[PDB]
Design goal:
part of a larger assembly; 2 chains; A: 50% helix; B: alpha/beta; 3-stranded mixed β-sheet; 17 helices; 45% helix; phosphoprotein (chain A); ATP-dependent protein folding chaperone (chain A)
């Protein structure tokens, strides 16, 4: 049972003590934390998600800190380090003052009003991108994989993701989500080079297919996804006692085999050479598809079959009587089980599903692929952020000092108490460029003031300090950029826990 | 023990009330609670959290139970009755410390608990409707997270709450009441936000049929199907003969035809509009459409059962009987005054308009944002609960917080004549009252005294009423905290809850005031 100012300070003390070297970790210039173990295992990492798990958590706020970092790590996975940065700041800077000046809420209310100001300021300084131009994206994706600091293989992972993400770009809620990642399906292939890795229509299933799964090459002929209602009926239309004994084999299989016949003969009409049985798969079911003169495929994940519902792009139907191409296995379909390396790989092509190509990844080894693979998984998060937000915003101090003066002027135009939160928030921004100047090796308060002069005149439009070169820079000219979304999102997330930990005055049992 | 336990009971009351204060109301803040060990949960509404809280005292124990008692009645006042009990114990324990008996005190408290309710009894408002409860629109408007709902802040709130107050909604076979009993009132973001409208009929999130289904059928009886037609898998039910390869599959075609028959037999007895909770096959719908009947399938059950219960007669969503299809007796008739699949919220949905024998309306609020549909949802649930208490009780007191200042005074009045110790036993009973604006102002980061004092300075005599806010009390605010009128922001209370919260804290404290020992070996 702990509470109040002490906690309110302890919240900062919990949250803030994290980010210290973690902000130095931000940027390619980075100061790895050494994590020794009580075991003695030494860890040099700039990435909080690893740092967060491994460290003793001294406070339940740290436990809460983990949440929103895992959130963004789940939300995108980009800028996870950055979400815990400004959450402590808001708290760290003002909190003690304004609760000594008595209020949770005036800051809590001044979280949102500072928030949208950036979002509003962002959409001005966030300027649209050409997704029509893959390179207008790629340069950021290149800026993103050099953020991941692999330009060797991942510059290809750029294209492969990009080309894929542009293809895995689609979705419709009626609000029409731009990308869909749960469509995007990579492969993991030894053999071939990742330069020979590509993306083809529909969801490539290597997931259940490392070996024979659906024949080999099923050219036109269909694959049949089964959400039926195929369970072989012990009786005819009724289920009866299970089969323990010869009579039960005779009598019941009489009634069983004709039902799968009643079923998978309704399958043979849709022209499969292969039928992948996710539901209703049982000793009799797939046995009759070879009797139905179609390859049967056993006890398979519907995740695939849902990916496959995005691969051939069909739906899946539980209809026992109605089983068709449109019902399952839409389009002409291409079912190709290719051995890339030593493993046979179903490639479902001829996608009938909007855009929708999925990723061949074949590395000479699994490992040589993996370096592409992770940044390609990063690039898709990047690409979609460009897709979800097609406004590229200049990275760092340009997007940073810009909003601050607004917020100050905001605070100044508001000239209430909430001015102080904005004055805290606008100043809370300046850490990262300072941190970048901290990171680069130059004198920040100079460069800060210098960057203020960049805002005092330019409004720091494209001008931050560039932590790599540690100088006032044109992020447009530098090509230093990023989507508003992850910029917004990571920031918008950094607001949230500061709202939380300031709201929460009682830690009890 | 003794005073020490009666301080420890206070310390039990103290430590607890400290939290539920900070958790009190919407201004009440979420609080980390360790649930077991590594399990810590961030919540408020002590009655909720006290249950995840593990008490250090039977004193704290019984109080959680007391609020849990109060909770079983209503979750409202739970955090209060606790907070009140702490106030109580801290009031009289001093006197009990001082010269005063633990028995002599609670007399002038309990009997003042009779007095306060006797005012809360003589304080009511039977019309909580137009001036509303915590106004009318302001219940939802507060609970609005104002995005596209804010410009509609009165519009929606006046829409939804007047919809929440009373609009036409057939209950099961249409019992008339206010429709917070059930809301097929819905929200779907589409078109624009002003275009959000109450609908005359039934809102349905649904699969509207196809295949030559009439997209609108005026004046149609209904088949609301809890069922899923599909087909009944049968190789041989009818026409066993083998003549053409046509015929062998025409044997198993008869799963469909007996449906086709009984579909039309359901058409023949009656309905032109069919509502199926699950899927019907492409021929099943086709049977309705060749029957000329509109078949809306895969119909949302909550809406559908609310329709099916309102649809008239006894219907396939109120029926478990399925023959593979079941010809109606026209006691299976659902009923729709007229049936329309209409584009609403950029969405064509079947709108059952009322019932062929009965009347209903719903809402689907047109937004640009699911977030709109995320919030008025609450605002409904707020206003629904707000106006629910309005609806089952037209007896409600004006003000939730304006009572306190009057009550103390009203007790201060009632105090002075009692004399002896119990003039004061009323006063300290009136001192327990005063936390109500306080924790509010505290959770709202407001100065409690400058309100409750200013509150106590609204009077000529003591009453809560907008006619005299100057010469009497009225209403309350939360964020500022100050009194309002009725339809101003003006708070109310359903007269049921407080007296119970009053009753409980008075009684728990005295039994807490009961014992001087806790012994063990």
């Amino acid at each position: 049972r702990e509470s109040g100012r002490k906690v309110q300070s302890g919240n900062i003390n919990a949250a803030k003590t994290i980010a210290d070297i973690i902000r130095t970790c931000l940027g390619p210039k980075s100061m790895m934390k050494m994590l020794l173990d009580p075991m003695g295992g030494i860890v040099m990492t700039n990435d909080g998600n690893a740092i967060l798990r491994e460290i003793q958590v001294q406070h339940p706020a740290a436990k809460s800190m983990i949440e929103i970092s895992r959130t963004q790590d789940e939300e995108v996975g980009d800028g996870t380090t950055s979400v815990i940065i400004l959450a402590g700041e808001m708290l760290s800077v003002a909190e003690h003052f304004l609760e000594q000046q008595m209020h949770p809420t005036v800051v809590i209310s001044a979280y949102r009003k500072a928030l949208d100001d950036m979002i509003s300021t962002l959409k001005k300084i966030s300027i649209p991108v050409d997704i029509s131009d893959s390179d207008m994206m790629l340069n950021i994706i290149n800026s993103s994989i050099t953020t991941k600091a692999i330009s060797r293989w991942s510059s290809l992972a750029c294209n492969i993701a990009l080309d894929a993400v542009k293809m895995v770009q689609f979705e419709e809620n009626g609000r029409k989500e731009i990308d869909i990642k749960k469509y995007a399906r990579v492969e993991k292939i030894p053999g071939g080079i990742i330069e020979d890795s590509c993306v083809l229509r529909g969801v490539m299933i290597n997931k259940d297919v490392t070996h024979p799964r659906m024949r080999r090459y099923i050219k036109n002929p269909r694959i049949v996804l089964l959400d039926s209602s195929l369970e072989y009926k012990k009786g005819e239309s009724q289920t009866d006692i299970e089969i323990t004994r010869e009579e039960d084999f005779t009598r019941i299989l009489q009634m069983e085999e004709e039902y799968i016949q009643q079923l998978c003969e309704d399958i043979i009409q849709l022209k499969p050479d292969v039928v992948i049985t996710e539901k209703g798969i049982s000793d009799l079911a797939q046995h009759y598809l070879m009797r139905a003169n179609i390859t049967a495929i056993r006890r398979v994940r519907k995740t695939d079959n849902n990916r496959i519902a995005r691969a051939c792009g069909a739906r899946i139907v539980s209809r026992p009587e109605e089983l068709r191409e449109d019902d399952v296995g839409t389009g002409a379909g291409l079912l190709e089980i290719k051995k890339i390396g030593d493993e046979y790989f179903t490639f479902i092509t001829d996608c009938k599903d909007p855009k929708a190509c999925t990723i061949l990844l074949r590395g000479a080894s699994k490992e040589i692929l993996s370096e592409v693979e992770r940044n390609l998984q990063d690039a898709m998060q990047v690409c979609r952020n460009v897709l979800l937000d097609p406004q590229l915003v200049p990275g760092g101090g340009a997007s940073e000092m810009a909003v601050a003066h607004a917020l100050t002027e905001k605070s100044k135009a508001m000239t209430g108490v909430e001015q102080w939160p904005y004055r805290a928030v606008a100043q809370a921004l300046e850490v990262i460029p300072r941190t970048l100047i901290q990171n680069c090796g130059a004198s920040t308060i100079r460069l800060l003031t210098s960057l203020r002069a960049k805002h005092t005149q330019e409004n720091c439009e494209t001008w931050g300090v560039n932590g790599e070169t540690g100088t006032l820079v044109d992020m447009k000219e530098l090509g230093i950029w990023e989507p508003l979304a992850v910029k917004l999102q990571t920031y918008k997330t950094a607001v949230e826990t500061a709202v939380l930990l300031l709201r929460i005055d009682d830690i009890v049992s | 023990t003794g005073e020490t336990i009666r301080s420890q009971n206070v310390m039990a009351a103290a430590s607890i009330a400290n939290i539920v204060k900070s958790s009190l109301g919407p201004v009440g803040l979420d609080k980390m609670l360790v649930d077991d060990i590594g399990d810590v949960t961030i919540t408020n509404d002590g009655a909720t959290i006290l249950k995840l809280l593990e008490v250090e005292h039977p004193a704290a124990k019984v109080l959680c139970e007391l609020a849990d008692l109060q909770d079983k009645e209503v979750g409202d006042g739970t955090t209060s009755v606790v907070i009140i009990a702490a106030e109580l114990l801290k009031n009289a324990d001093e006197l009990v410390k001082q010269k005063i008996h633990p028995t002599s005190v609670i007399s002038g408290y309990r009997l003042a608990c009779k007095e306060a309710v006797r005012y809360i009894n003589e304080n009511l408002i039977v019309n909580t409707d137009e001036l509303g409860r915590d106004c009318l629109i302001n219940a939802a408007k507060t609970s609005m997270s104002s995005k596209i709902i804010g410009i509609n802040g009165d519009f929606f709130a006046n829409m939804v709450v007047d919809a929440v107050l009373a609009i036409k909604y057939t209950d099961i076979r249409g019992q008339p009441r206010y429709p917070v009993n059930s809301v097929n009132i819905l929200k779907a973001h589409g078109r624009s936000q002003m275009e959000s409208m109450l609908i005359s009929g039934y809102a349905l999130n649904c699969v509207v049929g196809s295949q030559g289904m009439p997209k609108r059928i005026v004046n149609a009886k209904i088949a609301c199907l809890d069922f899923s037609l599909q087909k009944t898998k049968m190789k041989l039910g009818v026409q066993v003969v083998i003549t053409d390869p046509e015929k062998l599959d025409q044997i198993r075609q008869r799963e469909s035809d007996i449906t086709k028959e009984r579909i039309q037999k359901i058409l023949a007895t009656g309905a032109n509009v069919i509502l199926t909770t699950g899927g019907i096959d492409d021929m099943c719908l086709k049977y309705f459409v060749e029957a000329g009947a509109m078949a809306v399938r895969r119909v949302l059950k909550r809406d559908l059962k609310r329709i099916a219960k309102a649809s008239g007669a006894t219907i396939l969503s109120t029926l478990a009987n399925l023959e593979g299809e079941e010809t109606f007796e026209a006691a299976m008739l659902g009923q729709a005054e007229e049936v329309v699949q209409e584009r609403i919220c950029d969405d064509e949905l079947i709108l059952i308009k009322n019932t062929k024998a009965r009347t209903s309306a719903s809402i689907i609020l047109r937004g640009a944002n699911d977030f709109m549909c995320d919030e008025m949802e609450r605002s409904l649930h707020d206003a629904l609960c707000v106006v629910k208490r309005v609806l089952e009780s037209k007896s409600v007191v004006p003000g939730g917080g304006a009572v306190e200042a009057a009550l103390s005074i009203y007790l201060e009045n009632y105090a002075t004549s009692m004399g002896s110790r119990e003039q004061l036993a009323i006063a300290e009973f009136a001192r327990s009252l005063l936390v109500i604006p306080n924790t509010l102002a505290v959770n709202a980061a407001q100065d409690s005294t400058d309100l409750v004092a200013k509150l106590r300075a609204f009077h000529n005599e003591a009453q809560v009423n907008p006619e005299r806010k100057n010469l009497k009390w009225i209403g309350l605010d939360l964020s500022n905290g100050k009194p309002r009128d009725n339809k101003q922001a003006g708070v109310f209370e359903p007269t049921i809850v407080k007296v119970k919260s009053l009753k409980f804290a008075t009684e728990a404290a005295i039994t807490i005031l009961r014992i001087d020992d806790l012994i063990k070996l």
